[PDB]
Design a protein around this ligand. Structure first.
Ligand SMILES: COc1ccc(/C=C2\S/C(=N\c3ccccc3)NC2=O)cc1O
Length: 328
């Protein structure tokens, strides 16, 4: 069978919490007043919800209303409990309220509103310093939720709301997030394809917080190199082949050999043999201004096959890449 794995940090956080903290199936939702919130315009539709900009008429302030499509009560309470546990943490989106939507017949989460700059203007104009700044702001959020027993499992540009005017960042969409318990086997069908960690792509279920750091590396590579997404697979199989053309196939085999994992035989025809590449290969005159030796070394230490060898969020915040960022 496969070799078990545990997180190298925050391993026992949920163990020594009261069972109330992580036993989300037992959570009792405390409902607000649906009539306090007036929908203004639809902002998005996902597979699991729709999201609206709205007004809270008791303070005339804008809020964002996420009305869940029908989903199992378990998963609704999971998201709710996680939002409540993490509320007030650095750069975590704030759950303001929860109300019963009369039309949907499902819960509606009420969030703080972020005046977000949308993501193509952000991708096109963020400077070297801005990338470092916002990376640091993201690591603050990730170190907080990891220290609180929670992995996000869906880190990607669209879940990072930035109001670039006020240099304000918020990590959103906790609907895939889970509590980390040592030895617990999880569902590998999480994260968007381009940000899925190798552990997911080789069907290794006993993963942990370090999955978020792989996804964060994919975001970082897309920004400093100006290739979004960076690993652009046509499906989950070709996703792993795209990674292996950069990180090499020899270390991929070392990885699965360490955990006594076996690749799906369907890779036999498509994986090939690939050397590991130096990151300088992706540097050119149109992304040069975003690359430094520090950037490449930091990236290199995030994008590791072995989830156990990636930097933790806290370790990443110690990296020289962030020495130039003004600390508050
Ligand atoms: C414009 O400002 C905001 C925008 C979004 C959120 C929070 C969200 S959005 C979400 N899920 C989605 C996303 C896209 C489509 C459908 C559902 N989950 C969250 O927590 C908070 C904001 O202040």
């Amino acid at each position: 069978g496969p070799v078990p794995s545990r997180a190298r940090v925050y391993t026992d956080v949920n163990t020594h919490r009261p069972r109330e903290y992580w036993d989300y199936e037992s959570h009792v939702v405390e409902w607000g007043n649906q009539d306090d919130y007036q929908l203004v315009r639809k902002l998005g539709r996902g597979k699991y919800s729709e999201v609206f900009e709205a007004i809270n008429i008791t303070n005339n302030e804008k809020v964002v209303v996420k009305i869940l499509k029908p989903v199992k009560k378990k998963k609704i309470k999971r998201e709710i409990k996680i939002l409540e546990n993490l509320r007030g943490g650095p750069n975590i989106i704030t759950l303001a309220d929860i109300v019963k939507d009369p039309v949907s017949r499902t819960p509606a989460l009420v969030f703080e509103h972020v005046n977000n700059t949308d993501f193509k203007q952000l991708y096109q104009t963020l400077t070297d310093y801005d990338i470092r700044f916002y990376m640091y702001e993201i690591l603050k959020a990730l170190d907080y939720c990891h220290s609180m027993g929670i992995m996000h499992r869906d880190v990607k540009p669209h879940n990072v709301m930035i109001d670039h005017e006020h240099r304000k960042l918020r990590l959103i969409d906790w609907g895939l997030a889970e509590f980390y318990h040592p030895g617990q086997e999880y569902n590998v069908r999480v994260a968007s394809r381009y940000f899925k960690g190798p552990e997911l792509l080789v069907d290794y279920q006993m993963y942990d917080y370090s999955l978020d750091m792989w996804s964060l590396g994919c975001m970082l590579a897309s920004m400093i190199f100006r290739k979004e997404p960076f690993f652009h697979g046509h499906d989950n199989y070709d996703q792993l082949v795209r990674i292996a053309k950069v990180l090499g196939t020899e270390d991929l085999y070392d990885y699965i050999d360490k955990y006594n994992i076996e690749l799906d035989p369907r890779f036999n025809d498509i994986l090939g043999r690939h050397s590991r590449k130096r990151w300088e290969r992706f540097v050119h005159s149109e992304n040069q201004h975003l690359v430094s030796p520090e950037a490449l070394d930091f990236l290199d230490k995030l994008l590791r096959y072995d989830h156990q060898s990636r930097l933790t969020a806290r370790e990443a915040m110690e990296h020289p890449y962030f020495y130039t960022v003004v600390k508050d």
